[PDB]
Structure 1
Amino acid sequence: MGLEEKKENKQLTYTTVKDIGDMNPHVYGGSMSAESMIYEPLVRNTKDGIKPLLAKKWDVSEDGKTYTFHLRDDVKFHDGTPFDADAVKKNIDAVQENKKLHSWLKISTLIDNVKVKDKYTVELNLKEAYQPALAELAMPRPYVFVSPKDFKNGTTKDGVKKFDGTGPFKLGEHKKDESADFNKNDQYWGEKSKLNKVQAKVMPAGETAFLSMKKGETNFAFTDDRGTDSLDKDSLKQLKDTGDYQVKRSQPMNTKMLVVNSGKKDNAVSDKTVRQAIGHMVNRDKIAKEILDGQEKPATQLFAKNVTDINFDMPTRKYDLKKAESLLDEAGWKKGSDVRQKDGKNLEMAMYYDKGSSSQKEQAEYLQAEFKKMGIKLNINGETSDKIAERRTSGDYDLMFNQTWGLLYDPQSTIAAFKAKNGYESATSGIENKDKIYNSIDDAFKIQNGKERSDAYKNILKQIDDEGIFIPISHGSMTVVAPKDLEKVSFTQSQYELPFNEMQYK
């Protein structure tokens, strides 16, 4: 039934641990790959650089503050209404009404106004010139376009009425926490999909997602926008051994790391000395080789040198238990017993991991047992990726697993996120010199000479590394399980989308 019924209907159903969330692409809770299926930006950012999309040609003034966009005249939203310069203006205006939500993306701080020149010409006026503007208008959020007809009283910051975009699929039926359909858009202006329907199906990871893939109740799987893979290696081995599934892994795209909350004045992780101690207690070589079964390489710094503007080797603290012990002694956390104490309190920490990531869970369990030998009670907590993200915002954590944001985002956007409420500001909020460091991040984004810019990033990361906020563990990639007879599965530069409209023969 399952796998052939879905080939006959030209259908993917993919397994995921979480629902698609709030499909308003002007905010950030909704699934990134889902939103990349229905919404589109003016321009896209390929490996060849900027390529036209909803804007076909565009002009740039000499002073660099005015961008003129000539728009396709053959684009309609999923509700019928036309995409035109007016539509572009209302969208960008609605986003800038809520620009506090977006300050991690510098372009939102410089957008002065949007002006309609005529039916299909729209003019973007900035307050300074800024060459990443094209790059940031190509991001999947927030500068993508929703049918103005769905605006709430001309606004999007407080939600939308329907979720109508210009993409190759349209949102169909969606059962909260159960499923969401992505029906082929027959009116799509560009490369029309060959699949009739991609459906998200929500279910726990582990055996229950493996079995559903084996029956063909789902036939597809990819690591989600929080880096969670619903199928571990052995499940991939068995799914390959059916002769029914293929598996593709992308180039490395990110660094997975432990995030340490310098702001949690509650806990010893607000003490720099302790942060430097535990940064010596993470045996990344053995994690990458035994815990992750060789599927990821160890990461020694936060951004690998294949990353733009990273031109330095800056290896972080190595696994060294003797250094760890002396730093904890220096901080007042002595061994009484093997447990470590200070002012009549045992050294405890609360660590958080995605309960849907089997690899985060096993890493959390390995670290718990390692930390016990040091005298630290590591209390580990398995939660949804969405609860992890909110702790990341509220700061209510001591340690958590996370990862960098990938090839389109590292290092510049991730580093900006060091000071963003919806980024990693909670974790850096306890650094004494955070004012200087935060101002360096704003300044580094102004430097045009690459080497002196690369040095600005280097000095920033050097201090962040010395503060022990981020313990890099391994380099993650994008993994896709797909029917063996499904063609044209490839990767973009983003870990947050897949060319669903290109895949074929199933």
Structure 2
Amino acid sequence: GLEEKKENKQLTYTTVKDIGDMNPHVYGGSMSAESMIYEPLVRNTKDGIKPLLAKKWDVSEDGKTYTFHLRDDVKFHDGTPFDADAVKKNIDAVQENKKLHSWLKISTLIDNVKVKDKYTVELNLKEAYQPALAELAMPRPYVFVSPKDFKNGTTKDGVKKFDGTGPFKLGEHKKDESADFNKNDQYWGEKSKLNKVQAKVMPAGETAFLSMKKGETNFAFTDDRGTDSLDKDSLKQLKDTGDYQVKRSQPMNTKMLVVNSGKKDNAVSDKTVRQAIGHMVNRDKIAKEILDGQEKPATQLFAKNVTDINFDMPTRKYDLKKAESLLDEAGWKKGKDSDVRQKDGKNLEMAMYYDKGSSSQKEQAEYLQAEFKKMGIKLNINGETSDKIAERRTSGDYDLMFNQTWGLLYDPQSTIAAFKAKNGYESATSGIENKDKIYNSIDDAFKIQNGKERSDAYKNILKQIDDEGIFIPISHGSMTVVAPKDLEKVSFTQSQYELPFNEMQYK
């Protein structure tokens, strides 16, 4: 129960998905799990870049050479040392697979790494690049795995064990059931007060709620795909027990519909149909009624207050006459016979995908399905695992899906770069006729030093992307955490993908 977990210094969180592949040089694994065990050279905080595995660093005059002075007291979880050599091998191993990392521009600029002495490592770039430190602070890919865990000096095809430097170590993992993160008693920095944090896999909804009420789990938080295992009324019922508190971060992302311009066998490949769909999403009512006012509606992909945006570019409004008139233009007309829309003898249908673990995504899917039926479209909705949603996002096998932007450290520049990445939203943009010009504009934008000129370059990109109807913004997501009422020091970083497990502490 709760008491015993308090007494034993344990947290056990409920989640709908397993930790996956804990090699942090690739992206399949749980993000928060990996940030408990692996560490970057530096951290990107609300106060800027701060030391972590590197204590200090020098940038050359020309901006091409970063020299990192490493901590000398760090060990990997297997007992092997952390040093310049380990840094160079990790970065070389990531760079050996740089096609996977091309969403992050530094991976295209890294020339070589050199070891200067035992705790001094030089990183040489092809050109100067001021976001370098920021990109090195990300949770993947530039975090450090024991080189003894490499497979013949590589990580691109996996690692043999999952030894990092972080405040927790990976312990017993039973596939689709539980994973243990045990306190790293040799940790170099702020040691965990908790002995163990356990990720316990179970379906969302009633199972998760009961698990929590009885203290079999005693913690929850929005996973890395944005899914909250507990709905608003579960949260109410848990606060009401007296045992639990509920914290919610500042708004971190935009939650949107993705509309696959590249799906050639379906109507969503027609710009006009995409524009029509855009007027069929009542974001105001969804925010107020379906999401219980817990999120504000989103009228553009990246909110005005996001870095380098600072513009209002309101998207298509909810307007069914406008939708009708656009579907008629596209030749998807109803009939006196029926209210159902047809073209060339075929009915208008589309397949929408949502995470079956998200009650909010499911309710939205049901709503929209009802709303699309009024328009004479048959919207087939499919709840799947977030792992399956992601695979579909990469393959392009979908007409519409729920998704979300990547948060405060990624929006807008990384999320925009992902518009032309295979592992991001390239599927959805791949059917735009001016895609060659937009993709080139994306590359150009990142080279613009002046803030205002850059914001304008982003505006020109986003305007065309809005024109295309690729993304339909809906609401602004936060990170939500349920925790024991006597757990102190639960707080949020800039990321929606980690939590300070090693700082949390009972009573």
Whether TM exceeds 0.5 here: the answer is yes
Provide the rounded CA distance (Å) in 1 between the counterparts of 2:459 and 2:484: 44
Q: 1:120 deviation in Å?
A: 0.1
Provide the rounded CA distance (Å) in 2 between the counterparts of 1:344 and 1:196: 64
Q: 1:416 deviation in Å?
A: 0.1
SS in 2 for 1:327: helix
Provide the rounded CA distance (Å) in 1 between the counterparts of 2:115 and 2:395: 40
Listed one character per residue, the Cα deviations across residues 162-198 of structure 1 (whole Å, up to 9, x for unaligned) are 0000000000000000000000000000000000000
Provide the rounded CA distance (Å) in 1 between the counterparts of 2:222 and 2:290: 18
Provide the rounded CA distance (Å) in 1 between the counterparts of 2:485 and 2:339: 53
Q: 1:400 deviation in Å?
A: 0.1
Q: 1:27 deviation in Å?
A: 0.2
What is the match of residue 195 of structure 1?
Answer: 194
SS in 1 for 2:246: strand
Listed one character per residue, the Cα deviations across residues 405-460 of structure 1 (whole Å, up to 9, x for unaligned) are 00010000000000000000000000000000000000000000111110000000
Listed one character per residue, the Cα deviations across residues 441-484 of structure 1 (whole Å, up to 9, x for unaligned) are 00000000111110000000000000000000000000000000
Provide the rounded CA distance (Å) in 2 between the counterparts of 1:442 and 1:145: 28
Provide the rounded CA distance (Å) in 1 between the counterparts of 2:208 and 2:447: 47
Q: 1:4 deviation in Å?
A: 1.0
What is the match of residue 383 of structure 1?
Answer: 384
Q: 1:316 deviation in Å?
A: 0.2
Provide the rounded CA distance (Å) in 1 between the counterparts of 2:90 and 2:387: 26
- Segments of structure 1 that go 5 or more residues without pairing to the other structure are none
Provide the rounded CA distance (Å) in 2 between the counterparts of 1:271 and 1:332: 11
Query: Is 1:484 matched with 2:485?
Result: yes
Q: 1:239 deviation in Å?
A: 0.5
Q: 1:5 deviation in Å?
A: 1.2
Q: 1:379 deviation in Å?
A: 0.2
CA RMSD of aligned residues (A): 0.4
Q: 1:236 deviation in Å?
A: 0.4
SS in 1 for 2:502: helix
What is the match of residue 63 of structure 1?
Answer: 62
Report the count of equivalent residues. Answer: 505
Provide the rounded CA distance (Å) in 1 between the counterparts of 2:454 and 2:310: 10
**Identity value in percent:** 100
Moved more, 163-172 or 302-311: 302-311
Q: 1:45 deviation in Å?
A: 0.1
Listed one character per residue, the Cα deviations across residues 272-303 of structure 1 (whole Å, up to 9, x for unaligned) are 00000000000000000000011000000000
Provide the rounded CA distance (Å) in 2 between the counterparts of 1:75 and 1:306: 39
SS in 1 for 2:505: coil
SS in 1 for 2:280: coil
Provide the rounded CA distance (Å) in 2 between the counterparts of 1:102 and 1:339: 45
Note the 1:255-334 alignment, pairs <5 A: 255-334=254-333
Listed one character per residue, the Cα deviations across residues 108-161 of structure 1 (whole Å, up to 9, x for unaligned) are 000000000000000000001000000000000000000000000000000000
Listed one character per residue, the Cα deviations across residues 215-249 of structure 1 (whole Å, up to 9, x for unaligned) are 10000000000000000000000001000000000
TM-score (norm 1): 1.00
Provide the rounded CA distance (Å) in 1 between the counterparts of 2:44 and 2:417: 19
Note the 1:488-503 alignment, pairs <5 A: 488-503=489-504
What is the match of residue 428 of structure 1?
Answer: 429
What is the match of residue 248 of structure 1?
Answer: 247
Note the 1:8-47 alignment, pairs <5 A: 8-47=7-46
Listed one character per residue, the Cα deviations across residues 82-132 of structure 1 (whole Å, up to 9, x for unaligned) are 000000000000000000000000000000000000000000000010000
SS in 2 for 1:115: strand
Note the 1:142-161 alignment, pairs <5 A: 142-161=141-160
SS in 1 for 2:43: strand
Provide the rounded CA distance (Å) in 1 between the counterparts of 2:320 and 2:147: 59
Provide the rounded CA distance (Å) in 2 between the counterparts of 1:96 and 1:104: 13
Q: 1:311 deviation in Å?
A: 1.4
Provide the rounded CA distance (Å) in 1 between the counterparts of 2:503 and 2:238: 24
Provide the rounded CA distance (Å) in 1 between the counterparts of 2:455 and 2:392: 31
Q: 1:505 deviation in Å?
A: 1.3
Provide the rounded CA distance (Å) in 1 between the counterparts of 2:317 and 2:141: 39
Q: 1:271 deviation in Å?
A: 0.1
Q: 1:393 deviation in Å?
A: 0.3
Provide the rounded CA distance (Å) in 2 between the counterparts of 1:453 and 1:289: 34
Query: Is 1:357 matched with 2:358?
Result: yes
Provide the rounded CA distance (Å) in 2 between the counterparts of 1:464 and 1:52: 38
Q: 1:305 deviation in Å?
A: 1.5
Provide the rounded CA distance (Å) in 2 between the counterparts of 1:449 and 1:498: 33
